[PDB]
Design an enzyme around this catalytic site. Structure first.
Site, PDB file in Angstrom:
ATOM      1  CG  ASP A  48      14.240 -39.513 -16.731  1.00  0.00           C
ATOM      2  OD1 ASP A  48      13.540 -39.462 -15.677  1.00  0.00           O
ATOM      3  OD2 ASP A  48      14.134 -38.665 -17.649  1.00  0.00           O
TER       4      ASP A  48
ATOM      5  CE  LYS B 223       9.315 -39.333 -10.839  1.00  0.00           C
ATOM      6  NZ  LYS B 223      10.144 -38.911 -11.997  1.00  0.00           N
TER       7      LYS B 223
ATOM      8  CD  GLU C  96      13.265 -36.845 -11.788  1.00  0.00           C
ATOM      9  OE1 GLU C  96      12.679 -35.762 -12.021  1.00  0.00           O
ATOM     10  OE2 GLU C  96      12.661 -37.914 -11.590  1.00  0.00           O
TER      11      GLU C  96
ATOM     12  CG  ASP D 254      12.522 -31.555 -15.325  1.00  0.00           C
ATOM     13  OD1 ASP D 254      11.686 -31.764 -16.237  1.00  0.00           O
ATOM     14  OD2 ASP D 254      13.162 -32.474 -14.766  1.00  0.00           O
TER      15      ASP D 254
END
Length: 382
Positions: free
Chosen positions: A8, A69, A173, A197
């Site tokens: 992850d 990211k 994800e 999330d």
């Protein structure tokens, strides 16, 4: 060959797991931490990655890189890139259309593509797994948000390749989270799955319909700039105000003092998920003045009441965009550390009128868990 791992590669923190002997093991780093900051730092003498990089951020802010990211697979001129650059202490420069982070490193100006920065984080995750397994690790499944385009996916894959990983597949994800709970393996027809999330720096709501091994993304919603760090910041501001009232000092511009208070606040937030109070204990926070105090769970909830309630709007929007009623959701899946917050679980469960939440897998680890399962499948060892 070797063991295949699930990684992850998170915005703020990364996590690596391995499926072996019928079980997923999430791998502790050398500080014993099951997650690792997605941070890289450059000094006069060395390059630091993970905990060591984050530990010196206040002393070296302009050469300590994070949020790669948010840059990965994007162009310099991207509206998102131009907006985000404002909030970073490090420099982003334009190399023939592409963004690069520019730092000082061993008395020299160097620059790195976002995928090189992420490759360094991936190298650390690889080494973490090798330190645990006692074996070379090459194969991996790496995760990305469902909304990542092909440029972002390719650049994430490229980060792995640069790190010496054989990226078996890039998977979403929310798919990884659903795989962790075996939601594609239930005896039935369609299953509508909501993934909630709430990460360190991003809030992603995903609605999936799983049938016949296809994970159809029905809807995505959320807030790209809301995460656990916002809840920590409300606590930070709270104690900055307290120290001002107590001692007639504004510590705001002392980066080291603020960083130490923030770390204490992050720890308090975790503690408040399983206890109704937390101690704050900082020796010589500022000018040799100790800061020892406490905060109750109720006060933490009060400081964040708007932000907590506000998480429900993206859930409503996801439902509307997926054309589904609350009651058509088969499974709710919790991902990200902030989903451990009792008030958030209560809010979400009340919203779904008492429906039970899938939360038995450490929400900070659920994505790497599913990635590790998928990695085992793809390498042919499950």
């Amino acid at each position: 060959k070797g063991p295949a791992v699930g990684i992850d590669l998170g915005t703020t923190y990364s996590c690596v797991g391995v499926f072996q002997h019928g079980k997923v093991e999430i791998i502790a780093n050398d500080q014993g931490n099951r997650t690792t900051p997605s941070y890289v730092a450059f000094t006069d003498t060395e390059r630091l990655i993970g905990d060591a990089a984050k530990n010196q951020v206040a002393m070296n802010p302009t050469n300590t890189v994070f949020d790669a990211k948010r840059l990965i697979g994007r162009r310099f001129d991207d509206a998102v890139v131009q907006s985000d650059m404002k909030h970073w202490p490090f420099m982003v420069v334009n190399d023939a259309g592409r963004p690069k982070v520019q730092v000082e490193y061993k008395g020299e100006t160097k620059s790195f593509y976002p995928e090189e920065v992420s490759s360094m984080v991936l190298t650390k995750m690889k080494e973490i797994a090798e330190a645990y397994l006692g074996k070379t690790v090459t194969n991996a499944v790496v995760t990305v948000p469902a909304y990542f385009n092909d440029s972002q996916r390719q650049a994430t894959k490229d980060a792995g390749t640069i790190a010496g990983l054989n990226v078996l597949r890039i998977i979403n994800e929310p798919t990884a989270a659903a795989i962790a709970y075996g939601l594609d393996k239930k005896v039935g027809a369609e299953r509508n799955v909501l993934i909630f999330d709430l990460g360190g720096g991003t809030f992603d709501v995903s609605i999936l319909t799983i049938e016949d091994g296809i994970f159809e993304v029905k809807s995505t919603a959320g807030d790209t700039h809301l995460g656990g760090e916002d809840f920590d910041n409300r606590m930070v501001n709270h104690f900055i105000a307290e120290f001002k009232r107590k001692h007639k000092k504004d510590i705001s511009e002392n980066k080291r003092a603020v960083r130490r208070l923030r770390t204490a606040c992050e720890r308090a937030k975790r503690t408040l998920s399983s206890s109704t109070q937390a101690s704050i204990e900082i020796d010589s926070l500022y000018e040799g003045i100790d800061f020892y105090t406490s905060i109750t769970r109720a006060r933490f909830e009060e400081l964040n009441a708007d932000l907590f309630r506000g998480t429900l709007d993206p859930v409503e929007k996801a439902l509307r965009d997926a054309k589904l009623d609350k009651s058509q959701i088969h499974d709710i899946v919790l991902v990200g550390g902030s989903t451990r917050i009792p008030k958030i679980q209560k809010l979400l469960q009340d919203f779904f009128n008492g429906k039970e939440l899938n939360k038995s897998i450490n929400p900070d680890e659920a994505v790497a868990y599913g990635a590790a399962v998928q990695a085992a499948i793809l390498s042919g060892d499950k």
